[model samples]
Target: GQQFSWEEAEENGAVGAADAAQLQEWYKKFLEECPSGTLFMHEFKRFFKVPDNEEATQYVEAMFRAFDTNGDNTIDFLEYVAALNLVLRGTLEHKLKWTFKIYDKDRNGCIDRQELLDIVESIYKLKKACSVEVEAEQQGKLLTPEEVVDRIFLLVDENGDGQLSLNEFVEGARRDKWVMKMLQMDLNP
Candidate 1:
């Protein structure tokens, strides 16, 4: 029944519009483009060129949920702005958190091996130009999807709980040269 005001969005760091004028400008553009008032999965599929593969479909769904912060089926202007802010201006931690969101497909607050496996496979398939072994050269290790997933869990699952929490995931990614490079290469950052 409601949307965030500019003041609230600014407070939430969801937008960096500087002032009401800038906010209004974006608001106009948003309305002009999204006349239906919400962005949907179909639009994301087209814009992102989501391939008609299982991995790509699952990954795209995860990404859509990450952007649909309100748990609604669509992305409103506020959510869109927040996503844009994160992509364009958010720090490394923010980007990492967003990645975590995408990987945690079940929304269970933790990433398990299967989840990591899916995301890693999805990354390879989505890019399509790189081979697993070639990408694995950073660590001098040849990697298949399973091999990479095993490596990550072996190194990053610090608690041996068979699950990766946010701290473990982020800290592990940051500290691991290969993992960090892999993510950076794909994230377009």
Candidate 2:
């Protein structure tokens, strides 16, 4: 994994020529599999690395289609890099937008309480499984999924409304103290 490339390439030069060469080797291997230099859903799934035995199972195909932005069922390097960066190196705003799409399960422009609940449930269970540690208040309190969703709305909702408008989710996340923390975590599929 991280053992490849060079020793001091930690700064991004970090990967050095050795790693670059090794990267080329695999690049060629992938290219061989995809002669058009575009990655199809099947090939991209290998890179997605979603574990079969996890809740992330719900989003693999959705993610695949999302990444294939061209609606052509395939991804070129640019599209591939966009998706990769969004997950691996995306900024706060970038992540908020991306997470909005993910959270919008109905593909509607707005995020409702149920969609929020689905997201928090996934994040809560996923975090619990990873031992990320719940909030101190949740130590003794049983934080039901509904409770978590309400808590989020309580903190982030500004207009005393129900559903989080796209503007609300995007702007609300910016104002959320936990947003940065959550974004920092590698919220993988």
Candidate 3:
């Protein structure tokens, strides 16, 4: 089994000033007890108040990060497949079944990289459009794709490596506890 270096593991919320020893002990237990197939779901549920939502918001966000391998803030087919396998490590059949349903937007058996990119881009655009519509309704201004893409790209490039990789994708998802905290804080304060 591959264990993270102290620094890498610490960066993933496995270490802290107040209860480092206790946390490490618990982390070990959690890793030992949790089923690999459900680790992502478990970590995701642990971070949020509501756990039962079929589409748990945090979990979906983690999924997005996991699938956005190469950290390009965009997902291609290979990255998506790698995420499904890594995050859902149970029966291969189960993984593939869900992936086909998720990525096969046109109900086609095969997903080319371009098609995959289009789907992700569409989802990003739709979300931006919806948010813009809501704000525009209140303020009479609309947001554009160029603006949205710029923000989205920052999240996707976790390592600032200019390209994403499987490790970066997994790390991004698992490290969301810290990222979300930063997002919620007032940096200037």
Candidate 4:
């Protein structure tokens, strides 16, 4: 019956190395917010103020995949705490590593051109979804997803390889101001 215990999370330092008492307090708060002891995608979207649309949906789903590492279609307590701790306390290197995983949709340990394009497009669509008053044609002249993807690949694709390994992504993107701006998601909500 002990399905979601903090003990497992403690072992992995998923709760930011919180002691049992602090972990217990967090557990109580978690259940108060998500009594099911798990976080569903819809609730996550609402909590994060995600705009509703196919593109935003896709982006949120991709983010959900990143958070729900166990792939059970839900973020369990450990996973939730893991994600929270990482978002709140993890270093840039750690976040970049995790961001690489999000872009690497196929879990092949590398990000291909199409995968990067998909993520970039999703990000663009989310922006469009937020600002519908701005005509699509007006924004069409702006940097296209293909251009962004090409630029990112140009910056990060070391050895002239089409695929971006974690090392390449972390090191290359971190060093580039432009790529960092494009790759970062503003979580101000």
Candidate 5:
């Protein structure tokens, strides 16, 4: 929901407008132009252009490193989630806490296979139902559930040991220099 709202703001020419009607109009226009499930990685990359700024490059590279836990360039679902959690905590700790509450279906401290699967299934359903079109053409290549699972495994397996560890997840966040940059960005007088 927040993601959609951000997209709506960016789509509208008047990004700073605070009126309810303007917000609704912006969202309607965004839905028409980009759709609900549109992947915007390509457009974001082009807009941000990682090459021009070393800080931006480090930011993206750190994300890749966090996702590629096993030193492989590709990411699997588990690693993706781990990376996402790290970013979320950095950006919105309270929201992440609430999200974890929902994701921990068994009321367990850690998310296990079933809980993870449920979350993934929910995302798939949302994307499918919303008919989101990813602006990144490369992401258009369809991936089977099995393939997606394997990819996630590779990413979360930081030790190349085919299993995920809480330590790895925490380490990924702690070592991310881009995250530190983001913290600095937030610190204002």
Candidate 6:
């Protein structure tokens, strides 16, 4: 008696591959690996083939933790879909939220200076490792992580409070192309 269309899914967030088959296939695999249809954090780690560095592990762990809303140490289908929706085809607002969620490690609803730098460095290293195009604004003088963090802080700290709320984060992401460009590492690209 009810139905939803790909157009509707695209409008909401799951654009491009609005086909449910891929989603269902992923779900099936998820269940096979985790019969409960929940992806535990340890299981989630299997999805990424990162190096031995602890920071590398921390970066992906933070991302998984943010999406593990119920805090039962696992991410359900809904949570996974939410992640993919924002990851795959969501709008700028969704992307901003995703980025903020990843950086706000303390879950304090704001980003302090250290956390912001950590996030930036993580993204920088993550992208550099992926060979993402992160260069040329001042190619000869590439900004250090510290310098980039300072620039980001100055760019986003709206009240000059030295901390960034989600709104400030969204504004900063929108205002600075660096936020998007430095971190968009396509798996197949």
What C-alpha lDDT do the candidate models reach, one value each?
Answer: 0.69, 0.63, 0.42, 0.73, 0.44, 0.65
For each of the candidates, the C-alpha root-mean-square deviation to the true structure, in angstroms, is: 4.9, 8.6, 13.9, 4.3, 16.3, 6.9
Q: Supply candidate 3's per-residue lDDT for 183.
A: 25
Q: Write the per-residue lDDT of candidate 1 for residues 1-189, one digit (tens) a residue.
A: 564454566476555456656767777776776664666787666656655544456556666677776767877666666676676665657777888787777878988888878777877765554333356557675657788888778787667886689998888876675777665544552
Q: Arrange candidates, best lDDT first.
A: 4, 1, 6, 2, 5, 3
Q: What is the TM-score of each candidate against the true structure?
A: 0.72, 0.62, 0.29, 0.76, 0.33, 0.67
The lDDT of model 3 is 0.42
lDDT of 6 by residue, 1-189 (tens): 122223445465644454666765776676776666656676667665535544456667767877775656766665667676676673446667777777777877878778867777776665565534557355676766688777777766657976678888787777575655543434234
Clashing pairs in 2: 5-19, 9-14, 10-14
Residue lDDT tens for model 3, 1-189: 223334435476655565556545544555566533223334443543344433334336545543443334543323433454454444433433343334444444543343345434555434443324345345656565454344434563555665434344334434444432322222232
lDDT of 4 at 12: 64
lDDT of 2 at 136: 42
Per-residue lDDT over 58-143 for candidate 4, one digit per residue giving the tens place of the 0 to 100 score = 77777788767675677766666667677766455788888888887777777888888988887877776764545645756665
Give residue 155's error in model 3 in angstroms: 16
Sort the candidates on TM-score, descending order: 4, 1, 6, 2, 5, 3
lDDT assessment of candidate 4: 0.73
1 against 3, candidate with superior lDDT: 1
- For model 3, name the residue pairs that clash: 70-163, 70-164, 70-165, 71-164, 73-156
Better of 1 and 4 by TM-score: 4
After the best TM-score superposition of candidate 3, give how far the Cα of residue 11 lies from its true spot, in angstroms.
20
- Candidate 6, residue 155: the lDDT equals 67
Clash tally, candidates in order: 0, 3, 5, 0, 8, 0
Query: Where is model 4 more than 4 Å wrong at Cα?
Result: 1-3, 8-23, 32-36, 47-55, 131-141, 187-189
Model 5 deviation from the true structure expressed as Cα RMSD, one decimal place: 16.3
